[PDB]
Amino acid sequence: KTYTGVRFFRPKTLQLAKAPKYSRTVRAHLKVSGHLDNHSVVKTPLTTEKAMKKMEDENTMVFYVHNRSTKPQIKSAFEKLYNVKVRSVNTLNTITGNKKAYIRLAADSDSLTLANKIGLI
Amino acid sequence: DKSVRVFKLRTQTEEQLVGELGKLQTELSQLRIAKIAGGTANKLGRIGIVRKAIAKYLTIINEKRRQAVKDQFKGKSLKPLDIRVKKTRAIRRKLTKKQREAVLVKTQKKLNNFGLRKFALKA
Amino acid sequence: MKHNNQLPVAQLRKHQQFRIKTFFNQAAQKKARLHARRAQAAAVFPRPTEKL
Amino acid sequence: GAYKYLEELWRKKQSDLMSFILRLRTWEYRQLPVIHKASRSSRPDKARKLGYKNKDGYAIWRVRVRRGGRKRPVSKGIVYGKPSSVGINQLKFARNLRSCAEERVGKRVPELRVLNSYWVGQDGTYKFYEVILADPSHNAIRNDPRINWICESAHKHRELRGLTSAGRKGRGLRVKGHRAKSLRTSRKGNWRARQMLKLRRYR
Amino acid sequence: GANKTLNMKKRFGRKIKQNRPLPNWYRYKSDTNIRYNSKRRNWRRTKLKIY
Amino acid sequence: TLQRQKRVLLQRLKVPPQIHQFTKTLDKNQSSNLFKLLASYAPEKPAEKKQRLVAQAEAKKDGKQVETKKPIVLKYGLNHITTLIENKQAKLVVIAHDVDPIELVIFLPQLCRKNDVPFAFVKGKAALGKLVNKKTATAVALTEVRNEDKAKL
RNA sequence: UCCUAAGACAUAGGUUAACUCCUUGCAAUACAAGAAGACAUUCGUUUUCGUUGUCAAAAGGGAAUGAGGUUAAUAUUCCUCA
RNA sequence: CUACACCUGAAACAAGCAAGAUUACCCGCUGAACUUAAGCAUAUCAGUAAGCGGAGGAAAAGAAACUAACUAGGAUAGCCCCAGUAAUGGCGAAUGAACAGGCUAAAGCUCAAAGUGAAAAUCUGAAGUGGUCAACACAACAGAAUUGUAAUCUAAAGGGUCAA
Ligand SMILES: [Mg+2]
Ligand SMILES: [Mg+2]
Ligand SMILES: [Mg+2]
Ligand SMILES: [Mg+2]
Ligand SMILES: [Mg+2]
Ligand SMILES: [Mg+2]
Ligand SMILES: [Mg+2]
Ligand SMILES: [Mg+2]
Ligand SMILES: [Mg+2]
Ligand SMILES: [Mg+2]
Ligand SMILES: [Mg+2]
Ligand SMILES: [Mg+2]
Ligand SMILES: [Mg+2]
Ligand SMILES: [Mg+2]
Ligand SMILES: [Mg+2]
Ligand SMILES: [Mg+2]
Ligand SMILES: [Mg+2]
Ligand SMILES: [Mg+2]
Ligand SMILES: [Mg+2]
Ligand SMILES: [Mg+2]
Ligand SMILES: [Mg+2]
Ligand SMILES: [Mg+2]
């Protein structure tokens, strides 16, 4: 028709959503959620003079964390698992290939206690 | 403290198997914490036991879920690839028997009106 | 190139190493043919072996 | 039948009609990409003889291939070797153009199977061909006993193995006879065959 | 130096673990000929490939 | 750009006789009349063949054989029409001007002259399609008419 | 990690028996390729403006932290304070 | 000019197909020098190595535009012969097949092209129904197709008329 512009451009077409006909795999069809489980997030407690000095003195716990985990993931998972309020999470990748997490509890809880219930004393 | 028997597991429900899974996992973590702090050989063995256990539980759960999805899709082609036959790319890519033997008209005619016969010569 | 003997005719001039044929299969092959023939008879039983 | 009429038309190519249709065509093709997909077959009476059919599962594509000869790809015309080997300009490529066309199509469209091809005309610097492909993923081709053969694994990319009419010609296979003896069953195989030194356990 | 890829870290960790000596109790097995770990490596005398 | 240019070349070039003779088309009146007649002669759609096969099968299977009439059909198609032109059977030939490629239809006109059959150039292949229940047809022909239509022929 | 540089590579188009090769920021040897808004808030609807990618800097560009204390081994990172 | 039809091209979406691997054997290309000619260019090594593109369980080849001239034979492939022969070659070095004949093995078939025109008789998908339910049989509805699908036909025939 009437053209304001000098150049052609492709007409807007109705682009439908992608609708599978059959579900591609079992998992898909079962609507499997890949979120990492809380207990796979926090793995192991740390016993070293360092770890302990941190538990006694700094109100901190040191745990090995699942490698692909994030800090917020650790905070949440640690609360859901241990019934504690985590004030801060810090992350290390050891050369040995693990994630150290330095966790500081709020003033509410006491690391030493969680230690005691866990069998870490 | 006893070994886990498969059939016994296939007896229960999905809920049941799941709850048990969670329990087992919690067990494991407690146990590794055993290793780390101080621990008795009992706890060490406990570890391997519970691991294998958890595997078994999962195995069952999938057996069930699977047979379920297969059930829904029973009867239809256009199942999810998970379930579709996996043999060889070459196998599936190939022609059918229907198509292998399938024959042009003139052919069916000759096959009727001429064909091959049983004969014997005598001497 | 020395004596009165007839002018040689070259054989191994090219690389024949790649081109040699070996006959040990022959032994088994004969046998195979036999059984083939026989298994033909059995499957053709009422009819003659060689066509007219 | 309309088809014989067409045939004679195309055998008449010098007539002003044919020349006209051709210059026009050639122009169109020069306008389209090097390898494009055709919607119909510019030459139906020909495409038929090769086994095109209008039913789903058949496709035609046009290709334009460069006219010429093979300049030898060595740099700066430099070739180290005896005077017979140094040579560049006047060399001609072993396989024919038509076959080239087939193979370019074949590679642009590797899913399909090349059945055949036919000349749609040529200009000064080009030659245009249409190539007839069957889609082996289409049940029509599968269930048809006539073309279902080209559906099985062994028939893959026959243009490239020179099993096309063009390939067969390039192999001299359009000659059966004692002038052809050397060519039969792959002149490399014919050659290996004679070259064989046979050594039998007895004698 | 300081700066490293993950890949690097992981590889280094690997080779670090693999560099342990044969555990003293493996030499007591019935089917083994292995007195020592023949594959041990010393950073000074032999270098890895990481780039 | 192509589509336009094709047209332009066709106009600005020297078009030969055969191709140009397809430029002669019945003025809207003539055409329209012709389409009316041909439309009256249209061939069966599917439903109509089902009805008649079912109905005739019931008549022959149940009561007894009935006398059937040789149907009066419109002719369609290049090979068929060509044959019917060779055999003199065609009373009327109607060709579309719009055919591509033109070769398909080019022998028709002189063919009809040699067979003394009247041949016309109409504008549309789509039109011929509608007459025949296809997307497009190259040519349409008439063989039999019924007394009423003789006047028109 | 983001940014751009000397540069480089896709895509598109073309060349090759083929592999390979040629172009592309002043962006093309290409070109019916984009972005935004709003209601809708999915689509859809609707509106507006529109030619089309990416990688390359641990000295270049580059949003904001400091002092004190602590370990056998880390710290402008942990602790305390600001 | 509009609706609409058809030709041509485009986007998104559904269902399917290709992309790499394999090395001994197979296919299509590409392609040298060392070496031998007691030098060396033609030649030889040799269509050989290296390189590239394609497969398969085998590949390729195959129903004559073949031989042979004889009282002829008769697809393709391998074995034996013909043969180190005819021929090729600075007629130097050196290249070098096949027919006939003895065997192994055996097999023959599908299209284009006057002919449904008493009627697209055709092909593909298919919500679905039966099923041995991935593989089978029907299937409401949809597409492909007269710029032609299926039945007859393929030269050994064949159409038309009879017909055991
Ligand atoms: Mg064998
Ligand atoms: Mg089509
Ligand atoms: Mg050139
Ligand atoms: Mg060329
Ligand atoms: Mg073949
Ligand atoms: Mg470094
Ligand atoms: Mg050193
Ligand atoms: Mg060194
Ligand atoms: Mg730049
Ligand atoms: Mg550049
Ligand atoms: Mg800064
Ligand atoms: Mg701070
Ligand atoms: Mg369309
Ligand atoms: Mg490959
Ligand atoms: Mg040597
Ligand atoms: Mg010497
Ligand atoms: Mg030679
Ligand atoms: Mg294989
Ligand atoms: Mg010999
Ligand atoms: Mg013989
Ligand atoms: Mg169904
Ligand atoms: Mg339809």
From Swiss-Prot, chain A:
Signal peptide start-end: none
Entry keyword annotation includes rRNA processing: no
A GO molecular-function annotation: rRNA binding
Entry keyword annotation includes Nucleotide-binding: no
Alphabetic keyword roster: Ribonucleoprotein, Ribosomal protein, RNA-binding, rRNA-binding
Cystine pairings recorded for this chain: none
GO BP annotations, alphabetical order: translation
Protein's UniProt name: Large ribosomal subunit protein uL23
Family named by the database record: Belongs to the universal ribosomal protein uL23 family.
A GO term from the CC aspect: ribonucleoprotein complex
Curated annotation (Swiss-Prot), chain B:
One BP annotation, GO: maturation of LSU-rRNA from tricistronic rRNA transcript (SSU-rRNA, 5.8S rRNA, LSU-rRNA)
UniProt-listed InterPro entries: Ribosomal_uL29, Ribosomal_uL29_euk, Ribosomal_uL29_sf
GO MF terms, alphabetically ordered: mRNA binding; structural constituent of ribosome
Keyword terms, alphabetized: Ribonucleoprotein, Ribosomal protein
One GO term describing the cellular component: cytosolic large ribosomal subunit
Statement: the UniProt record of this protein carries the keyword Lipid metabolism: no
Coiled-coil parts of chain: none
Pfam families tied to this protein: Ribosomal_L29 (PF00831)
Similarity section: Belongs to the universal ribosomal protein uL29 family.
Protein's recorded name: Large ribosomal subunit protein uL29
UniProtKB/Swiss-Prot annotation, chain E:
GO cellular component entries: cytosolic large ribosomal subunit
SUPFAM superfamilies: Ribosomal protein L39e
A Pfam family recorded for this sequence: Ribosomal_L39
GO MF entries: structural constituent of ribosome
GO BP term, example: translation
Keyword set, alphabetical order: Ribonucleoprotein, Ribosomal protein
Family statement drawn from the similarity comment of this UniProt entry: Belongs to the eukaryotic ribosomal protein eL39 family.
HAMAP family referenced in this protein's UniProt entry, alphabetically: Ribosomal_eL39
Name of this chain's protein: Large ribosomal subunit protein eL39
Lineage per the UniProt record: Eukaryota, Sar, Alveolata, Ciliophora, Intramacronucleata
UniProtKB/Swiss-Prot annotation, chain F:
Record-annotated disulphide pairs: none
Signal peptide (from-to): none
Keywords: Ribonucleoprotein, Ribosomal protein
GO BP terms, alphabetized: ribosome biogenesis
GO cellular component: ribonucleoprotein complex; ribosome
Molecular function as annotated in GO: RNA binding
Family per similarity comment: Belongs to the eukaryotic ribosomal protein eL8 family.
Protein name: Large ribosomal subunit protein eL8
Natural source organism: Tetrahymena thermophila
Gene behind this protein: RPL7A
Region of the whole protein represented: 52 to 204 of 255
